[PDB]
């Protein structure tokens, strides 16, 4: 996309809750294409959002997204002969991808036995303020603003 | 000791435990469960002396096993290298026997390189 704007693909809803952001997390839970295995691990762990802390698997997910989505990020740019990390607002589309991705990583790293077990846990804790993706979101955000010295070094 | 040539594997099952011995893999092991009546399930602490001194009475009697077999295979080298025999001549070299390239790779018979 030197030329064009690089087409943003919509996703399907998910047959189970009809949510285009539930397909977007399951795709990032995916591995080797084996999506049938990618989909259990949600509803395997959605069930773990329901068993433990009896609530709403629909809504604990959708909060855990907004509880890891970073409004300010820093990317390094070259000026003078310097490597200044530039303060910038990470766009909403970048957010979705950013939110979901840390959410898989932080979860995969967890010391729990089954995959979904972690997945649920993380989602729970993200909305609760204390996850692994939630550190990373604050890390980037306060990495920015620590760098507001480079705010007009933004495009 | 405990069982067989003097080895010990509890806290796991009996069959997987019988693997852990020299001269029994996964096949000879489930052929011993056949010939004694033990059922591969039981967790070795969960076996009682009877079916464990039954175990032994068969396995310590049929095959060889610990101490030996190490000496038995080694006398298939003791003779191989004392013989002709090229194959025992690349035991005297520390080199791959079953005809692989040595120009490249070939490490597990030489060890990490120098």
């Amino acid at each position: 996309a030197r030329r064009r704007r690089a087409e943003v693909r919509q996703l399907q809803p998910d047959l189970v809750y009809g949510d285009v952001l539930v397909t977007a997390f399951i795709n990032k839970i995916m591995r080797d294409g084996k999506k049938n295995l990618a989909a259990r691990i949600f509803y395997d762990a959605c069930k773990i959002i329901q068993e433990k802390t009896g609530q709403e698997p629909l809504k604990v997910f959708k909060q855990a997204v907004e509880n890891v989505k970073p409004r300010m990020e820093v990317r390094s740019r070259r000026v003078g002969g310097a490597n200044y990390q530039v303060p910038m607002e990470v766009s909403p589309r970048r957010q979705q991808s950013l939110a979901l991705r840390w959410l898989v990583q932080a979860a995969n790293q967890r010391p729990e036995r089954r995959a979904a077990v972690r997945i649920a846990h993380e989602l729970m804790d993200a909305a609760e303020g204390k996850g692994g993706a939630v550190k990373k979101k604050e890390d980037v955000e306060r990495m920015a603003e620590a760098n507001r010295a480079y705010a007009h070094y933004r495009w | 000791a405990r069982i067989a040539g003097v080895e010990i594997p509890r806290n796991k099952r009996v069959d997987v435990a019988l693997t852990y011995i020299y001269g029994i893999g996964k096949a000879r092991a489930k052929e011993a469960l056949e010939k004694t009546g033990i059922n591969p399930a039981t967790r070795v602490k969960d076996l009682t002396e009877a079916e464990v001194v039954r175990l032994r009475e068969y396995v310590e009697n049929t095959w060889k096993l610990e101490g030996e077999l190490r000496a038995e295979v080694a006398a298939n080298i003791k003779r191989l290298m004392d013989i002709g025999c090229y194959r025992g001549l690349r035991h005297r070299r520390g080199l791959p026997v079953r005809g692989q390239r040595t120009r490249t790779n070939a490490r597990t018979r030489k060890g990490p390189r120098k």
Binding site: - | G84, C85, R87
Partner: protein, 78 residues
């Protein structure tokens, strides 16, 4: 079932050991299997350049001919 020894050599062999055991049979048959009559002699086997002799014993009966006169010269690297 199947054991292979050329039979131009086992012809001499069962003619040599028979008609007064000598030794020193030169041959180009390392493909043969050293059948148990060869026991105690001296076969001069061809590795390609040289006829390396072998003093045949019991310690190697079911064995072939060409393992016993290796084709390559090693000695070392360095």
């Amino acid at each position: 079932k199947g054991v292979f020894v050329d039979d131009h050599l086992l012809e001499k062999v069962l003619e040599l050991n028979a008609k007064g055991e000598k030794r020193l049979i030169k041959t180009w048959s390392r493909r043969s299997t050293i059948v148990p009559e060869m026991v105690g002699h001296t076969i001069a086997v061809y590795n390609g350049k040289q006829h390396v002799p072998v003093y045949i014993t019991e310690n190697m009966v079911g064995h072939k001919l060409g393992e016993f006169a290796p084709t390559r010269t090693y000695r070392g690297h360095g």
